[model samples]
Target: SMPFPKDCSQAMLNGDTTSGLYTIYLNGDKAQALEVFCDMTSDGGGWIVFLRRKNGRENFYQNWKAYAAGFGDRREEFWLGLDNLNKITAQGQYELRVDLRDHGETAFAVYDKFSVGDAKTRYKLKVEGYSGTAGDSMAYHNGRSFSTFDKNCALSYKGAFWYRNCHRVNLMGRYGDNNHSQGVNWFHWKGHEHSIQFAEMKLRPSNFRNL
Candidate 1:
């Protein structure tokens, strides 16, 4: 293992600056970085761990509308995309290095310590903070979907969905249901408010393997 940075812990405790590349050293090699995803960061709130691709360009899989509606057939693509991400980092241990961009007069805390382990214990997380039209949808399957407009949105989760680990900007409207028409809603969001939205999954080790 490479010599761990003495300030790494504190750095995780205090978010990194916006628009800067910070290297994460592991075992004498660079593993990950707090780098900009040009497309996403251009809109602000687009800082993701630019996984070292090793020259492999894997397309991001997102069929949120379909998957959320219980379309198990499309599940493979979703899981495969995640698995590909794990494979990218498995060559070396990895975790996201979060560095929150500064907002005037408001303090922000980035997500940290996301452990990326082996295939069975791989960590999968997706952040959604993109600017979109009101009625814009991310998932639509079996006649069900989740949409966002202004500060309102809607979705259906038959089972318990954990909201504890979620991080977001207060500027985004509070999330709730606005009837089946809207499904899940992000209402009351201030005009043109751009906030960090993310979803993370936690599975039992046994089920994790099946996934």
Candidate 2:
């Protein structure tokens, strides 16, 4: 094992100023190295971009297996995968950041604390302590289980996410569609029916600042 940085934050601290694909070790053993897209220019940098929805290029209506393994181009738009999400978050404490765009406007919602459970536990969600202009939309998914059209009931929504009945923000939905509770949405930012133009989800170590 090449003693790679544990995550994007570590990579940043090691002097990675540009955003690109990097081999990161999410666990303590340094045995497994995972490739992920690092956003080195957002906020203070060092954010691992897990999910991105810019255009309708990649389909969001995927099954449990697809989501678990992940899909799409890493350089363009993609989902980091549930298994990786669980492993990365389990490795250490992290903060969640959601960046959204509504036409010419942009907003971001950041959570001070965040984590995801293992696959056996349905990759449970835990995001808290919000502070940003995007509003507290993801907090409702706290303690929820990851679901898709195949595995647990994902309800009427088309995206695969921690669906517990309804959701305030479903970034996994269709890209071009615009229907209430359907396509990409951030209820508090816009309205239920207005799908945002862009959406991004990423995470960074909480203690990276020596906290």
Cα lDDT tens digits, model 2, 1-211, are: 2357888888888888899998898674567878999999988889999999998899888988899988999888799999989888987789999989877999999998988898888999999889999789887788998989888335477788888767888899878678677878887788678888888899998876563
Query: What is the C-alpha lDDT profile of model 1 across 1-211, one tens digit per residue?
Result: 2243212222232354343333333222445332122112322322233321111122222233322222221212112123333343443322332222222322122222222323333233332222232221211111121222210222222211112211111111222222222111222221223332322121111111122
Flag regions of model 2 displaced more than 4 Å.
28-30, 152-155
**Residues forming the 10-long window of minimal summed lDDT in candidate 1:** 200-209
What are the models' TM-scores?
Answer: 0.26, 0.94
Q: Tell me how far the alpha carbon of residue 63 in candidate 2 is from the true structure, in angstroms, after superposition.
A: 0.8
- Model 2: residue 15 alpha-carbon error in angstroms: 0.7
